[PDB]
Amino acid sequence: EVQLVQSGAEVKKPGSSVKVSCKASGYTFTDYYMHWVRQAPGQGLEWMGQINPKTGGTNYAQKFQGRVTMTRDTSTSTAYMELSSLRSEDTAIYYCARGGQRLLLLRNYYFYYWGQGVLVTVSSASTKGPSVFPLAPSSKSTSGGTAALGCLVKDYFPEPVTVSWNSGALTSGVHTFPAVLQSSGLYSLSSVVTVPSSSLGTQTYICNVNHKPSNTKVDKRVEP
Amino acid sequence: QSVLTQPPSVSGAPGQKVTISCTGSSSNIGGYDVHWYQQLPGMAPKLLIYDNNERPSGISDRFSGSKSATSASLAITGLQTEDEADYYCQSYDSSLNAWVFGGGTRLTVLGQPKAAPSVTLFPPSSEELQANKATLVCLISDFYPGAVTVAWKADSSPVKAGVETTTPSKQSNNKYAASSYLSLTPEQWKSHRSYSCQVTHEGSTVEKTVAP
């Protein structure tokens, strides 16, 4: 019935500014305060402030006083949160959430309706395609076996990358791991494929790695 | 960093009770109601309890809230795997003139058999070595519950430098996976007899080692 629809997902450099939008539908926009709540990844919830949609009046959380501007476009029923002088610790999911009714003297102060949230990633890193390296079959680390081989997708930015094997033909025994973020500001991941030892030399194994943000495709054949 | 205080994590067997504490002061909980949110992975927070002890429509009675002086508490009975989420308390602070949140409590529901991890350790490839880099890759999988720590040794000596380890992530089979990377110079790679990746799980260790 009421819906809060958000936009503005991106990857920013430190020093820049980002403007996130929250379009409200299903109620009279001007009847309720709108709040902004951020959540750095893996971390807690952080109230940023609120805006009165009728007047445009705002109240900002202490922490963000020098850097945040909340606005509203009543005609599009849209609330905006602009954060400036971004640094890496501003990497977060930014939510809008409806507050209590504007005119009520004692209004509710929980948040029932939330926007879906918008990821802002702040990094000094520049777009970088991965280097792909084969993880040659270690036969004596798959007890039972079979045997696991794979591909290391090293030093790319930003997320995401996708990997398949044999152009997607091989899907069984496939495990592609979540990426890690390094001190370089670059990501890395591995994809591995558990496979019958006697089939090592009979084909075989090609990892296809797609990194859209850099328009890089790598097809790495993994020899035993 | 966070004005209200919650325990970082709680856990329970399916069917059991868990309690999550939220502690504040006279300036917040002492003067205002406490609300609770359940955040499932990838979702916005979802109002779970409001005005200390009320449930929104749809929320099970297995969830109950209470408030007392300057703290509040969320009780969950008949714990279900579906309850696995992050829980936040929220109130308002009159001294700060601001909405305030707890730091969050991660609830794990132990809905699978305990399982030690499988550990696969890969040496640097010749290609990476030719790029004058070296990465050992330690892949950890099929462990439960999803908490491991990883120790790297160069021969017998621990290495802390150059180690980067992911947080555990839930596989499709409901067990967990994690990876750890050890960055080396190719000189470092060549100049030891071996490197080991030790994965500790529930006070038990599984180790793999490789050599140039």
Residue numbers in the entry:
A (entry chain H): 1 to 52, 52A, 53 to 82, 82A, 82B, 82C, 83 to 100, 100A, ...
B (entry chain L): 1 to 9, 11 to 27, 27A, 27B, 28 to 95, 95A, 95B, 96 to 106, ...
Give verbatim lines from the article.
An intriguing feature of one class of bNAbs directed against the primary receptor binding site of HIV-1, the CD4 binding site (CD4bs), is that they are encoded by the same heavy chain gene segment, which encodes critical contacts for this class of Ab. Here, we asked if HIV-1 Env vaccination activates B cells that encode the rhesus macaque orthologue of this gene segment and if so what the genetic and structural properties of such antibodies are. We isolated VH1.23-using CD4bs-directed MAbs elicited by subunit Env trimer vaccination and describe the genetic and functional properties of a panel of such MAbs. The demonstration that several of the most effective bNAbs are directed against the CD4bs, a functionally conserved region on the exterior envelope glycoprotein, gp120, has elevated the attractiveness of this target as a neutralizing Ab determinant.
We isolated a set of monoclonal antibodies encoded by this gene segment and demonstrate that one such Ab, GE356, binds the receptor binding site in a manner that is distinctly different from the mode of interaction of CD4bs-directed bNAbs. For the most potent of these MAbs, GE356, an Ab minimally modified by somatic hypermutation (SHM) as shown by analysis of its putative germline sequence, a Fab structure was obtained. Structural analysis allowed the interaction between the GE356 Fab and gp120 to be investigated through epitope and paratope alanine scanning, as well as modeling analysis of GE356 binding to monomeric or trimeric HIV-1 Env structures. These data showed that the VH1.23-using CD4bs-directed GE356 MAb interacted in a similar manner with its target epitopes as observed for two previously described vaccine-induced macaque VH4-using CD4bs-directed Abs.
